[PDB]
Design a binder for this molecule. Structure first.
Ligand SMILES: Nc1nc2c(ncn2[C@@H]2O[C@H](COP(=O)(O)OP(=O)(O)OP(=O)(O)O)[C@@H](O)[C@H]2O)c(=O)[nH]1
Ligand SMILES: Nc1ncnc2c1ncn2[C@@H]1O[C@H](COP(=O)(O)OP(=O)(O)CP(=O)(O)O)[C@@H](O)[C@H]1O
Ligand SMILES: Nc1nc2c(ncn2[C@@H]2O[C@H](COP(=O)(O)OP(=O)(O)O)[C@@H](O)[C@H]2O)c(=O)[nH]1
Ligand SMILES: C#Cc1cnc2ccc(O[C@@H](OC)C(=O)NC(C)(C)/C=N/OC)cc2c1
Ligand SMILES: [Mg+2]
Ligand SMILES: [Mg+2]
Lengths: 254, 437, 421, 51
């Protein structure tokens, strides 16, 4: 029996994860402020990392990486890229402006962005979810729902450009995910810490008319696509939770 | 030559005192009967080990220590131990019944009856001092004596020895190692009361010591003897500058001067390597580069916390053994690239290094292997506030229900000293925050 | 020297008292003549906690024997370890207390209490450093209940700063001497709320259920009930009687166990209750099992404020720890979250005689409120109709005093309900 | 990376490597105030025990 608390009820994603944990019968949910827990779906702000890993005879895991805000604050990310000896050909100049003047345009219609979901487990394996989504291109402002998933976009690129999604876009996305996460690893790794971390990330990318991929930003508390909630939230339990708390692949490892 | 007087208060303080003075004697070549063939200054000397031992005409070397407990069973073991011959009886002071884990009982009720006697025995030692540097005070945050009578003694030492420095070695409470449910109260009470009277305090988390014992020494359930023998290595590394020829940390003022820019933020984090099991026959001798890299591993810290998420105000590397300056800078060059060592802006990004050539001594039969080189890193990092955050959170849980408060108020303490002390700690946490982020 | 003074009062008090002394005399190597005949010094290291050392290196229990009738104390003087108690420390009267709390507290016992306090004073004065008092008694009769709590009131006056603990047998209609038992228990509990630091609540119903259901004893005697109390009192006191344990006396123990002055009534438990020795998991499961609890309360009906548990025998400490940390980390709903680390454990190498491994449990649980609700209901059922009151107003008591006992125990019960939330 | 202030003797050496620049009356009153709250509480106990 494994115990877990919940401290972010607004989490679109982890509401589904704690939902699955109970449906295994081997996970028991505690009160939000009970400290004798195994796993914690923590809050987004001021999450008490300094109180983890001090409970005798508890292996404690948390769904966030202390120090990862450096990547996920738009301000901080600029600072991170400019002062890191690694890092720069895929991040727009940052301090017409906002700004990329020549974006690849879907046809018919004459602009979009690509969201990739990346999961980093306690061992710092980097897991790219197979399913991305193409969505100012925002649900807030706005195919069914202005969301086009990978197989269609692949099919478009083949018929329209004679190229694939993997070749023209996804080699660049994998290179970018690995570069940001490889860079911040010594600062955030919980490899020899008294508690353990994993975290889901939402990378936002742009494609220009030369099929160059650009990094827009990195989301630390990302929502998902309703169609993919099932698949991905189960993949979380499999790779990030049960790999530490075993019971009785939809990811590309980078 | 300026003398240093050690005071050990309560169980934890007395037992750690035992482990230290046993280790000091082996390092200094003093036998349990107090004789020291190395010392040819018979009945005297102004050598550096005379900072901690005085001499008798008979040739005996006598620790400048005072042991204090509110009940007798612990100091009674000193009195009938291997090193019974070392201490003058005047030096070992016990009372009738203990403080029962009750800060208010050690400070107010029982403490008032014994504080003048203790100060008088200490005064005896001070009077044998041509020059006096100050005091080293060993105690637990959690005992009723260790917390309560210590803060009464620290208040009075500021009055009665106002020019002298006071250093603290404090055992921070861990539920792994025999806590009581009330030690978060005692810890906050004693930290509030003592904070203005201490110049530098080294906190030892029993959870940290306990894990290092299980992981590195492979002791399934470590005993206090196991813990204390490891703690007295760290202490010895810290006090070695005072007992040996050297130019770094050669009096107690340098500790404040090297490690403490802001008076309130006076809790350096200690990190120590290598801790090698003695039942481990074939072991490889770690390099300077290697033992120095280990100082930045959270798992060798005296207090579990993550310095990567803080800022350094000072750092001091103390090596013992086969170590030359070239290898240290070599090692440091490399760790600057691979580690997260953020300094506060109004401070140089540097390291004060001291090298002692005599390699660490270990108790024969102990569980600690003899190594050819060890280091202790002393660093003032805001990350240690994590330990305050844990303690203050436990205090707030119990105190919101007033649990156990009545035991303190029944000893003449007032409920409002609980909140006076916790407001101090809220301030302290905010100081680390202003400095650190 | 951490001496404890023991008092046993009335029929029940002296009978569980005599057994406690048989059991712990066996562990300490003391024969029924007081001469030490053991094999380890671990046996002698804390022997002075409970024993004076008399002139020819005999050991004399530091025990005061009190009753208003001669009959049970002639029994003690004639049992196995009868010769071992100090003859001066038998203090008795001739009249009896007729199962009447007012005779014990107000009339008969008042005659006799100064003479008990004389023996108590003489045992205390010979104490290097007196650690506190323990009293064995039932709450359902007259001497142990009414005079017992009169003694405690007087010991407080004379030693206001020593700890006072009781082992108190609560009455149950299922194991009953007379109807007035709830009257005597209700008046007794109010005294204990104000005047003890620790009370071990031994429900005679639970002791009987344990012999009947678990031990398979179809017709249990007091002898069989008392054998359980004896083994529990021997467990509870192991950390005081045996070396190397926690450097803790009664006051330290009481401080850590009682978060609030009035909430100090504890549920004791014991395991096992055969030649197959129990594995450390089996001990930890039985100890926390409701069937092993001696207060006839459901712990899953309230919450543990604090818990203390000792394990006796040769067993892995790490294994004791994993099991203890498994029991807590599986039912975290039954421990209050606002007293961090409120479960404490110890191992002692010396196991009880006739056993290879044992676990004794001490729980400050808010489920204990169920026991006072039970006594309060029995009390009110009679008191609404002023039934059987004449036995009490004949000894000078007034109805007002019953009303106030009833009101204070109702208070106590709702005070427990405040903290289970 | 600079190495300043190097001192050597026979027991060892020390140096600094910079990698980058930038009352009795009051105590008496509190202790005795606590002793008088104890004493006042014990008087309420003995009063109550006398009633
Ligand atoms: N590392 C270590 N910790 C100890 C030792 N003795 C006690 N402790 C710890 O110190 C705390 C208890 O404090 P004590 O030193 O025993 O208390 P005390 O100062 O003697 O005061 P009293 O309440 O009067 O008994 C707990 O957190 C223990 O884990 C020891 O020899 N070594
Ligand atoms: N340099 C650039 N060139 C072109 N389009 C850009 C751009 N920067 C942002 N955008 C547009 O802005 C949209 C998203 O803006 P941005 O990611 O920076 O804020 P956001 O609202 O997504 C914060 P969050 O994802 O955390 O909720 C994209 O759909 C994209 O069309
Ligand atoms: N467990 C136990 N209960 C007893 C014993 N003798 C009496 N009782 C119980 O104690 C109550 C009667 O009180 P008792 O001790 O006999 O009367 P007293 O002499 O006036 O104090 C009843 O609730 C009985 O069930 C005994 O030897 N063991
Ligand atoms: C007479 C008497 C007496 C009174 N009051 C006690 C409170 C607790 C207690 O506890 C022991 O019960 C098994 C025990 O072994 N306690 C350990 C685990 C050592 C520490 N407990 O910390 C609270 C014993 C007690 C014994
Ligand atoms: Mg003590
Ligand atoms: Mg009877």
């Amino acid at each position: 029996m494994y115990t877990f608390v919940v401290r972010d009820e607004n989490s679109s994603v982890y509401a589904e994860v704690s939902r699955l944990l109970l449906a295994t019968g081997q996970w028991k949910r505690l009160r939000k402020d009970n400290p004798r827990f195994n796993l914690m779906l923590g809050e987004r702000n001021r999450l008490p990392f300094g109180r983890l890993g001090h409970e005798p005879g508890l292996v404690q895991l948390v769904n966030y990486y202390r120090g990862a805000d450096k990547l996920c604050r738009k301000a901080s990310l600029v600072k991170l890229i400019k002062t890191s000896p690694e890092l720069c050909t895929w991040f727009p100049e940052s301090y017409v402006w906002i700004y990329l003047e020549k974006p690849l345009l879907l046809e018919p219609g004459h602009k979009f962005d690509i969201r990739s979901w990346v999961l980093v487990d306690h061992l710092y394996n980097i897991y790219l979810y197979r399913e991305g989504v193409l969505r100012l291109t925002n649900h807030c402002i706005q195919e069914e729902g202005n969301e086009m998933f990978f197989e269609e976009f692949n099919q478009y690129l083949m018929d329209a450009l004679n190229t694939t999604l993997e070749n023209s876009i996804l080699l660049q996305i994998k290179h970018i995910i690995r570069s940001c996460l490889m860079c911040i690893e010594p600062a955030i790794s919980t490899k020899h810490l008294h508690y353990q971390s994993f975290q889901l990330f939402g990378f936002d990318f742009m494609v220009d008319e030369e099929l160059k991929v650009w990094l827009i930003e990195v989301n630390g508390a990302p929502a998902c696509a309703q169609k993919l909630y099932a698949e991905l939230c189960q993949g979380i339990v499999d790779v990030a939770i049960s790999s530490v708390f075993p019971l009785a692949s939809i990811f590309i490892k980078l | 030559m300026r003398e240093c007087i050690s005071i050990h208060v309560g169980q934890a303080g007395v037992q750690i005192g035992n482990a230290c003075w046993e280790l000091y004697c082996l390092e200094h070549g003093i036998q349990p009967d107090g004789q020291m063939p190395s010392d040819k200054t018979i009945g005297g000397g102004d050598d550096s080990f005379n900072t901690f031992f005085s001499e008798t005409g008979a040739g005996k070397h006598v620790p400048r220590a005072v042991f204090v407990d509110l009940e007798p069973t612990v100091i009674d073991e000193v009195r009938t131990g291997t090193y019974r011959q070392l201490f003058h009886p005047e030096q070992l002071i016990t009372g009738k019944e203990d403080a029962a884990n009750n800060y208010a009982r050690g400070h107010y009720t029982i403490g008032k009856e014994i504080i003048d006697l203790v100060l008088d025995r200490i005064r005896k030692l001070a009077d044998q001092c041509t020059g006096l540097q100050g005091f080293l005070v060993f105690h637990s945050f959690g005992g009723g004596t260790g917390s309560g009578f210590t803060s009464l003694l620290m208040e009075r030492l500021s009055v009665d020895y106002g020019k002298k420095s006071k250093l603290e070695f404090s055992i921070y409470p861990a539920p792994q190692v025999s806590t009581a449910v009330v030690e978060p109260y005692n810890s906050i009470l004693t930290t509030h009361t003592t904070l203005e009277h201490s110049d530098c305090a080294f906190m030892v988390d029993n959870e940290a010591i306990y894990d290092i014992c299980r992981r590195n020494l492979d002791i399934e359930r470590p005993t206090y003897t196991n813990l204390n023998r490891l703690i007295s290595q760290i202490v010895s590394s810290i006090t070695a500058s005072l007992r040996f020829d050297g130019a770094l940390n050669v009096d107690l003022t340098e500790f404040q001067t090297n490690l403490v820019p802001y008076p309130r933020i006076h809790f350096p984090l200690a990190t120590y390597a290598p801790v090698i099991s003695a039942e481990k026959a074939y072991h490889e001798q770690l390099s300077v580069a290697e033992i120095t890299n280990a100082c930045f591993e959270p798992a060798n810290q005296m207090v579990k916390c993550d310095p990567r998420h803080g800022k350094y105000m000072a750092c001091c590397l103390l090596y013992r053994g086969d170590v030359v300056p070239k290898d240290v800078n070599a090692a440091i060059a490399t760790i600057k690239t691979k580690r997260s060592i953020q300094f506060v802006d109004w401070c140089p990004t540097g390291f004060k290094v001291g090298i002692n050539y005599q390699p660490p001594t270990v108790v024969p039969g102990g569980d600690l292997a003899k190594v050819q080189r060890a280091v202790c890193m002393l660093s003032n990092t805001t990350a240690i506030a994590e330990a305050w955050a844990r303690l203050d959170h436990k205090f707030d849980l119990m105190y919101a229900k007033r649990a156990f408060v009545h035991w303190y108020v029944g000893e003449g303490m007032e409920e409002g000293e609980f909140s006076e002390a916790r407001e101090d700690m809220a301030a302290l946490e905010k100081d680390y925050e202003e400095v650190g982020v | 020297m951490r001496e404890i003074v023991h008092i046993q009062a009335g029929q029940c008090g002296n009978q569980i008292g005599a057994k406690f002394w048989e059991v712990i005399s066996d562990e300490h190597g003391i024969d029924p003549t007081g001469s030490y005949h053991g094999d380890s010094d671990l046996q002698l290291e804390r022997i002075n906690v409970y024993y004076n050392e008399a002139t020819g290196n005999k050991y004399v229990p530091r025990a005061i024997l009190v009753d208003l009738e001669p009959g049970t104390m002639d029994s003690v003087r004639s049992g196995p370890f009868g010769q071992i108690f100090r003859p001066d420390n038998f203090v008795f009267g001739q009249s009896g207390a007729g199962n009447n709390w007012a005779k014990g507290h107000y009339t008969e016992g008042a005659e006799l209490v100064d003479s008990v306090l004389d023996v108590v004073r003489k045992e205390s004065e010979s104490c290097d450093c007196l650690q506190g008092f323990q009293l064995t008694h039932s709450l359902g009769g007259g001497t142990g209940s009414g005079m017992g709590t009169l003694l405690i009131s007087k010991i407080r006056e004379e030693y206001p700063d020593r700890i006072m603990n009781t082992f108190s047998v609560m009455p149950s209609p299922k194991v009953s001497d007379t109807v007035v038992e709830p009257y005597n228990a209700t008046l007794s509990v109010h005294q204990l709320v104000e005047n003890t630091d620790e009370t071990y609540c031994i429900d005679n119903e639970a002791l009987y259920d344990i012999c009947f259901r678990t031990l398979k004893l179809t017709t249990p005697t007091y002898g069989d009930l008392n054998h359980l109390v004896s083994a529990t009192m021997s467990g509870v006191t192991t950390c005081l009687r045996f070396p190397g344990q926690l450097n803790a006396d009664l006051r330290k123990l009481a401080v850590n166990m009682v978060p609030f002055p009035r909430l100090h009534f504890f549920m004791p438990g014991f395991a096992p209750l055969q030649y197959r020795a129990l594995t450390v998991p089996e001990l930890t499961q039985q100890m926390f099992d409701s069937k092993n609890m001696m207060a006839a309360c459901d712990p899953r009906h309230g919450r543990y404020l604090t818990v203390a548990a000792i394990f006796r025998g040769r067993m892995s400490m790490k294994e004791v720890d994993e099991q203890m940390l498994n029991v807590q980390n599986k039912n975290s709903s039954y421990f209050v979250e606002w007293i961090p680390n409120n479960v404490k454990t110890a191992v002692c190498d010396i196991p009880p005689r006739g056993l290879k491994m044992s676990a004794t449990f001490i729980g400050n649980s808010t489920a204990i409120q169920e026991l006072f609700k039970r006594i309060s209901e029995q009390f009110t059922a009679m008191f609404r109709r002023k039934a059987f009151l004449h036995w009490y107003t004949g000894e000078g008591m007034d109805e007002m005093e019953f009303t106030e006992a009833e009101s204070n125990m109702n208070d106590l019960v709702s005070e427990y309900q405040q903290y289970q939330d | 990376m600079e190495v300043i202030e190097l001192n050597k003797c026979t027991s060892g050496q020390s140096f600094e490597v910079i990698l980058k620049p930038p009352s009795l009356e009051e105590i008496q009153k509190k202790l005795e105030a606590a002793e008088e709250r104890r004493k006042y509480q014990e008087a309420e106990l003995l009063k109550h025990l006398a009633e």
